[PDB]
Scaffold this motif. Structure first.
Motif, short mmCIF file in Angstrom:
data_model
loop_
_atom_site.label_atom_id
_atom_site.label_comp_id
_atom_site.label_asym_id
_atom_site.label_seq_id
_atom_site.Cartn_x
_atom_site.Cartn_y
_atom_site.Cartn_z
N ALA A 1 0.70 -1.20 -0.07
CA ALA A 1 -0.13 -0.06 -0.05
C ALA A 1 1.00 1.32 0.02
O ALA A 1 0.44 2.19 -0.30
CB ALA A 1 -0.92 0.09 1.23
N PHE A 2 2.30 1.25 0.54
CA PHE A 2 3.10 2.32 0.44
C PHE A 2 3.74 2.60 -0.73
O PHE A 2 3.79 1.74 -1.75
CB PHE A 2 3.92 2.16 1.52
CG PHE A 2 4.61 3.54 2.00
CD1 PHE A 2 3.71 4.63 2.66
CD2 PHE A 2 5.91 3.88 1.83
CE1 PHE A 2 4.30 5.60 3.32
CE2 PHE A 2 6.54 4.87 2.41
CZ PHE A 2 5.77 6.00 3.00
N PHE A 3 4.04 3.92 -1.20
CA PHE A 3 4.32 4.14 -2.41
C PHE A 3 5.70 3.52 -2.63
O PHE A 3 6.70 3.40 -1.55
CB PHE A 3 4.94 5.64 -2.83
CG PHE A 3 5.12 6.09 -4.01
CD1 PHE A 3 6.66 6.01 -4.41
CD2 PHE A 3 4.16 6.41 -4.82
CE1 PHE A 3 6.81 6.39 -5.74
CE2 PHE A 3 4.65 6.69 -6.34
CZ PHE A 3 6.15 6.67 -6.54
N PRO A 4 6.11 2.80 -3.65
CA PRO A 4 5.70 3.00 -4.95
C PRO A 4 4.14 1.72 -5.28
O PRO A 4 4.31 1.24 -6.49
CB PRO A 4 6.57 2.83 -5.94
CG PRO A 4 7.68 1.79 -5.31
CD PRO A 4 7.33 2.02 -3.66
N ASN A 5 3.69 1.27 -4.39
CA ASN A 5 2.42 0.68 -4.31
C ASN A 5 2.59 -0.71 -4.97
O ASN A 5 1.59 -1.22 -5.74
CB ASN A 5 1.49 1.36 -5.06
CG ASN A 5 1.33 2.75 -4.35
OD1 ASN A 5 0.75 2.96 -3.23
ND2 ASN A 5 1.88 3.95 -5.05
N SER A 6 3.74 -1.48 -4.96
CA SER A 6 3.58 -2.59 -5.95
C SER A 6 4.22 -3.82 -4.89
O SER A 6 4.98 -3.62 -4.03
CB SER A 6 4.83 -2.43 -7.03
OG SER A 6 5.05 -3.54 -7.65
N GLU A 7 3.96 -4.98 -5.25
CA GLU A 7 4.08 -6.23 -4.37
C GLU A 7 5.75 -6.64 -4.95
O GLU A 7 6.05 -7.67 -4.52
CB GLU A 7 3.15 -7.31 -4.61
CG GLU A 7 1.78 -7.20 -3.76
CD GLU A 7 0.88 -8.25 -3.73
OE1 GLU A 7 0.17 -8.16 -4.51
OE2 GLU A 7 1.31 -9.05 -2.85
N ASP A 8 6.13 -6.13 -6.07
CA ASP A 8 7.63 -6.17 -6.14
C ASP A 8 8.68 -6.05 -5.02
O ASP A 8 9.52 -6.51 -4.84
CB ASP A 8 8.11 -5.21 -7.44
CG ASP A 8 7.37 -5.77 -8.74
OD1 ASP A 8 6.65 -6.76 -8.78
OD2 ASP A 8 7.64 -4.88 -9.73
N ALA A 9 7.95 -5.31 -4.12
CA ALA A 9 8.60 -4.88 -2.68
C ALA A 9 8.62 -5.90 -1.63
O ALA A 9 9.23 -5.42 -0.65
CB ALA A 9 8.29 -3.44 -2.40
N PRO B 1 10.85 -5.50 3.95
CA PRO B 1 9.77 -4.55 4.15
C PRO B 1 9.05 -4.34 5.50
O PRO B 1 9.23 -5.38 6.18
CB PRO B 1 8.73 -5.15 3.27
CG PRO B 1 8.80 -6.70 3.32
CD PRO B 1 10.52 -7.03 3.78
N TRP B 2 8.82 -3.31 5.67
CA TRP B 2 8.07 -2.90 7.05
C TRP B 2 6.54 -2.77 6.93
O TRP B 2 6.23 -2.30 5.82
CB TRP B 2 8.57 -1.62 7.85
CG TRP B 2 10.29 -1.66 7.78
CD1 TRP B 2 11.09 -0.67 7.43
CD2 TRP B 2 10.91 -2.28 8.59
NE1 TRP B 2 12.21 -0.78 7.75
CE2 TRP B 2 12.31 -2.00 8.38
CE3 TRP B 2 10.51 -3.66 9.36
CZ2 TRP B 2 13.54 -2.58 8.97
CZ3 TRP B 2 12.10 -4.36 10.11
CH2 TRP B 2 13.22 -3.75 9.73
#
Ligand SMILES: CN(C)Cc1ccc(S(=O)(=O)n2ccc(/C=C/C(=O)NO)c2)cc1
Ligand SMILES: [K+]
Ligand SMILES: [K+]
Ligand SMILES: [Zn+2]
Length: 358
Positions: free
Chosen positions: A201-209, A227-228
């Motif tokens: 949900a946080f920028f940049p909004n992708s599940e790549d992260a 990720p936090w």
């Protein structure tokens, strides 16, 4: 007798938002950081490295020729075209000087990397804007035009050997999507990112992260996402993450050069990050990285949008590169429960690839 380099150029302040002078990615982000270095008299302790423009040949090390040609054309666009072209991207404003300033921040870093790898300085700090880590091969994103730290890793490879091992540590609060993508199939460049995620949900909004993206092909293992979720993170969480993940993996990679995508929007007081890392905290992280790659460390400014916070924070980082003692760090309270869950999630995703994790 080890020298610390410092690159800063006023002309990077000319990139600007002509419709909203209050946009948070402010020309005076770099002038405030630099001025804070004068007040603490760190400036005269560093060697001045000059800035230059990147060549278009150098830009092609990571970016398509189509993407270079469109940004380049914006130097002569009328305001209405500057606005329409800016709106075709995710979160980008553009003025006529934008192109040159993106050339200046990459070229400042190529010169900084060159001074390190010839042994002219031991380490270096790069006070530059606009930032780079969201920029993709094919497109601009999130205040970034060209991926300065990715271009810097390829330039370093180009003046040594192609397989030179470059660790990229990205402690900006947002995920560096463009950087992960550029090296996802690459085993010569190790990408380690800390970033607020919130289940995409946080920028940049992708599940790549998320933590399960560990790389592709021969690059399986050389992409680490930490990720936090659900907590106001601070110095405990980042000290535990270095202690369990970043420093073991990085010692095992044994880099020959270390680039820090050093955004300070996770610092206490930023209007975007919601986190509370202290300047003391950033200093300790700097001090730990200084133990890698025979000390060849380059600090690259990315995000960070509270003017006082980014000045104090990067200045502490320069004080570590110059050799000063790490400052008194307060108390490592226990981690927010969710931060423990996060670290374990990365240990389970990466222990098959790193023999120093379990
Ligand atoms: C919530 N939905 C609408 C998506 C969304 C759209 C825009 C923005 S934004 O405009 O606030 N924005 C852009 C870039 C940065 C950070 C840059 C940086 O520091 N990298 O290090 C912050 C936030 C969220
Ligand atoms: K990051
Ligand atoms: K990689
Ligand atoms: Zn950021």
């Amino acid at each position: 007798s080890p020298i610390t380099g410092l690159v800063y150029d006023q002309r990077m302040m000319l990139h600007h938002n002509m419709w909203d002078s209050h946009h948070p990615e402010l020309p005076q982000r770099i002038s405030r950081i630099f001025s804070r270095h004068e007040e603490l008299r760190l400036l005269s302790r560093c060697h001045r490295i000059p800035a230059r423009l990147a060549t278009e040949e150098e830009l092609a090390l990571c970016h398509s020729s189509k993407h270079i040609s469109i940004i380049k054309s914006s130097e002569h666009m009328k305001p209405r075209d500057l606005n329409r072209l800016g709106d075709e991207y995710n979160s980008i404003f553009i003025s006529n000087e934008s192109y040159t300033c993106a050339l200046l921040a990459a070229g400042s870093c190529f010169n900084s990397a060159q001074a390190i790898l010839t042994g002219q300085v031991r380490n270096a700090v790069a006070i530059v804007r606009p930032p780079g880590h969201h920029a993709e091969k094919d497109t601009a994103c999130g205040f970034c035009f060209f991926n300065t730290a990715a271009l810097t890793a390829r330039y370093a490879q180009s003046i040594t050997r192609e397989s030179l091992r470059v660790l990229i540590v990205d402690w900006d609060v947002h995920h560096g999507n463009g950087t992960q993508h550029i090296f996802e199939e690459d085993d010569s460049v190790l990408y380690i990112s800390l970033h607020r995620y919130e289940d995409g949900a946080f920028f940049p909004n992708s599940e790549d992260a998320n933590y399960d993206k560990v790389g592709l092909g021969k690059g399986r293992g050389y992409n680490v996402n930490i990720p936090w979720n659900g907590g106001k993170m601070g110095d405990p969480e980042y000290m535990a993450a270095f202690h369990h993940l970043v420093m073991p993996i990085a010692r095992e990679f044994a880099p020959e050069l270390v680039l820090v995508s050093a955004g300070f929007d996770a610092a206490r007081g930023d209007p975007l990050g919601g986190f509370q890392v202290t300047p003391e905290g950033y200093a300790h992280l700097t001090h730990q990285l200084m133990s890698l790659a025979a000390g060849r460390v380059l600090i690259i400014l990315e995000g960070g949008y509270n003017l006082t916070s980014i000045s104090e924070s990067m200045s502490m980082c320069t004080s570590m590169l110059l050799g000063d003692s790490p400052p008194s760090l307060d108390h490592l309270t226990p981690l927010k429960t969710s931060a423990t869950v996060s670290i374990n999630n990365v240990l389970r995703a990466h222990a098959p690839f790193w023999s120093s994790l379990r």
